[PDB]
Amino acid sequence: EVQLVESGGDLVKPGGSLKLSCAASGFTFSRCAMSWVRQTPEKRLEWVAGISSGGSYTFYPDTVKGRFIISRNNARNTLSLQMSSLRSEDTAIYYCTRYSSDPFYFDYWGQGTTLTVSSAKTTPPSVYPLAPGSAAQTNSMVTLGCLVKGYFPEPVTVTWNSGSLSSGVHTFPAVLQSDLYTLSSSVTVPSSPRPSETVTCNVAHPASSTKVDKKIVP
Amino acid sequence: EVQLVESGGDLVKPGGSLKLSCAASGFTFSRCAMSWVRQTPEKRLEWVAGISSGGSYTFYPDTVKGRFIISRNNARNTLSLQMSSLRSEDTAIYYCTRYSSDPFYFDYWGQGTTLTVSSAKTTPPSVYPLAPGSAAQTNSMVTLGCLVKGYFPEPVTVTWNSGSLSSGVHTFPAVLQSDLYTLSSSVTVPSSPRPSETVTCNVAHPASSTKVDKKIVP
Amino acid sequence: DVLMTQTPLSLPVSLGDQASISCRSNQTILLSDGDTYLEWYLQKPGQSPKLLIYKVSNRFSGVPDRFSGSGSGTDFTLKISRVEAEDLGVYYCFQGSHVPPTFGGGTKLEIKRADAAPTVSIFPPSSEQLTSGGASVVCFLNNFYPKDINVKWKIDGSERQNGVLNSWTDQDSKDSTYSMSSTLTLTKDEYERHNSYTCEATHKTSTSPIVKSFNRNEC
Amino acid sequence: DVLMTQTPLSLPVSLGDQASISCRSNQTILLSDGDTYLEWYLQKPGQSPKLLIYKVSNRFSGVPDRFSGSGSGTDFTLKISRVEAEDLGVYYCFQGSHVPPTFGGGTKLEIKRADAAPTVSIFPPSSEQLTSGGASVVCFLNNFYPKDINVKWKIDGSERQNGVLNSWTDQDSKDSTYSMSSTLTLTKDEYERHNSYTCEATHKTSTSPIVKSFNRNEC
Numbered sequence A, B: 001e002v003q004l005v006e007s008g009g010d011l012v013k014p015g016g017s018l019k020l021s022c023a024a025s026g027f028t029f030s031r032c033a034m035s036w037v038r039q040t041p042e043k044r045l046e047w048v049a050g051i052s053s054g055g056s057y058t059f060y061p062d063t064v065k066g067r068f069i070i071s072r073n074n075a076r077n078t079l080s081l082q083m084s085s086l087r088s089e090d091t092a093i094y095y096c097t098r099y100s101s102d103p104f105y106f107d108y109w110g111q112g113t114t115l116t117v118s119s120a121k122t123t124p125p126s127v128y129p130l131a132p133g134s135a136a137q138t139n140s141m142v143t144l145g146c147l148v149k150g151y152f153p154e155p156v157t158v159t160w161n162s163g164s165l166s167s168g169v170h171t172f173p174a175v176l177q178s179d180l181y182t183l184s185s186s187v188t189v190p191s192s193p194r195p196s197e198t199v200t201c202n203v204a205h206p207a208s209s210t211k212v213d214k215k216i217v218p
Numbered sequence C, D: 001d002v003l004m005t006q007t008p009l010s011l012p013v014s015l016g017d018q019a020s021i022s023c024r025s026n027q028t029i030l031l032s033d034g035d036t037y038l039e040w041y042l043q044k045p046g047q048s049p050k051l052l053i054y055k056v057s058n059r060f061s062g063v064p065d066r067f068s069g070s071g072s073g074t075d076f077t078l079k080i081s082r083v084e085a086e087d088l089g090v091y092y093c094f095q096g097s098h099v100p101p102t103f104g105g106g107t108k109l110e111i112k113r114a115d116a117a118p119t120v121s122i123f124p125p126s127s128e129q130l131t132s133g134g135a136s137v138v139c140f141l142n143n144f145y146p147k148d149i150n151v152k153w154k155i156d157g158s159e160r161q162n163g164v165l166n167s168w169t170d171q172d173s174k175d176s177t178y179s180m181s182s183t184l185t186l187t188k189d190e191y192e193r194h195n196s197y198t199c200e201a202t203h204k205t206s207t208s209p210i211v212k213s214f215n216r217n218e219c
């Protein structure tokens, strides 16, 4: 099992500084060279820092040269990216990567950590039960929802009835209004249940420990 | 055979930029100077650029002066307009013409491209069938129709029975209501087909690839 | 920027009649060199302009003898001798002897015609419409002459309304009539607050109104 | 920095067909040393990228012969021979032969299933939202193919309004459809002025709009 598990990303205001970190396992760390590569906003993938197996030669694109440092704590099998003067183009997901024995291309990516660089204040969500009203009737199925309106930053976790209801869920990608995100999830339950049985959305916004549960009642 | 065909008219938000090209053929390019000319909504005509045969020197009136440049390319056979900082007062059909030898009047006009400069959004038409109710009347000739309401921008195409019913259809001019178009078409069929044979109007809004067919039923 | 003024703006002429359209300028188009870069254009309904007469009066290719340019200096006049059907359109004079080039206002040649009376039809909202919560009552005033017609919408008694969309077709080529369409759009609940919708047409072929109507409930 | 143009943007293949993605470098990737290090990485949705092909021909371990890489020097191709449902993802070609290494922009492989029509559902605003001044009326259009769809919001039928957010999911791994959400956000006042609210869908499977409405007081 080769495993690369990153840690570190958080929301930072635009001049701040943050050291991201990655830990490796399953392979012979030193034999292998490492990297950090980022995936932005419209999924473009940029390489951002390569370092040799011995931490001897270290490599950078001009965009980050000088304001980001890479390090590879090889005794403790860590690798870290120390970055500073974070302008908003660093907003992205950073993936710890390892090169192959032929160190010009990557053959394993970690999970990724996100980093958001903005002045904007973290805001907890307001969760609104979306109980059917509509036109049309009822037979076979019903579909209910949750409007998780106005939050910053991403992510937020939506689960229906704590994990037991996974049949017809769709949680839509969040869009940004005025420095604040809004998303929603719909679920489909048989017409027999949602009246009598009950369905609940549980919205957890990690960056404020907000956990909300909202029961969908008619 | 002088042929001049324009392309690239489109919906632009007031402030944008667009380039209209015009492909000339069937005569010798580089001997004839060209012009672009406008037909506003109140059918007023306005000259908006001039270029002498070798692309040597461009001429403009004052309203566009500054804002548009008129290219040409004597090899690939193309005239064009680069429009930047579009005003809503540039909403018009843009013709490209051919200038005669004394390059001071036009002799052949192309087919035209519609420029609509507006903050409105592309919206598909709702089409509702206008089925005879009236003051009764089953005479010999009955009139049917269908309404194409709420669409942006122009144009839309209404044909009847896929074009195989081109008898006495009348399609009226679209007019703007709440920043949106509305157009309706009548058709007149002998009373003996009216229900027994199906009449259907088919609408197409190209700007949002919408194609709708509505069976006119009583 | 010399501004040309054309007179008339509409021009009823019976097939056979001659027509005279005058395009006077506010500046001397007479040029010393070569007496005037004045041209006359025709824009048939649904086509691009075509050139008819250039440099005050030479007819362009395929233009018939029936067209002839006159005038000089500042006043110019297109004359169309035996007007045939296919001369429907609007004509535009243009100034080329100066920057910027200047088009006129357009003269609409409309072919006079035996008068005709509107074949009127009135149509209720569709269910399809009513469900999205709007209601448009439509009235087609098809195939008439002249242009002038007057449409009054009446909803429950002589209560006329405000919120009517009217469009006319341009003169119908060979048949020579006009056609108009008036749509009255109300919201669903106001449409339901009433019961008689009357489309009432008044046209020079009648002192009596063409009244087409329906009463709000299918039963 | 070598520019790497990839096309297509999206390749809509059906299961069972062969698919080819092409990638072009604006400078060459052939390294004088012996050869090229042009790679192809797949990113199946919500997962981190994985190496399919390295040094253009060779598949990483795991990867099945079905995936085949190719070209040399400047043009590079990846051909998936007969597409299985779990190939959906974005392919990025990459180059390691010239510092700094660079990736393609991506090609999204879309599995094309049979046409499926949206299942549309519309929600009134919650009282909780409403008691703190806002109103978002939300329309879910679920489970359809193709992705192309148009929705319009009608307030009182008239108002086709614009103040609305839309959101699509990626193609759903378990059945190749999409979902869409549209949310009309208004204030309580604006909201309470009108009566019927409408969600109108137009999309290839139906030749009539799919309309869904609620009256905001029906008792």
Ligand SMILES: *[C@@H]1O[C@H](CO)[C@@H](O)[C@H](O)[C@H]1NC(C)=O
Residues within 6 Å of the ligand: D001, D002, D003, D026, D027
């Ligand atoms: C390739 O594209 C990049 C970005 O446009 C540019 O710097 C480079 O000069 C281009 N040409 C070559 C030969 O690299």
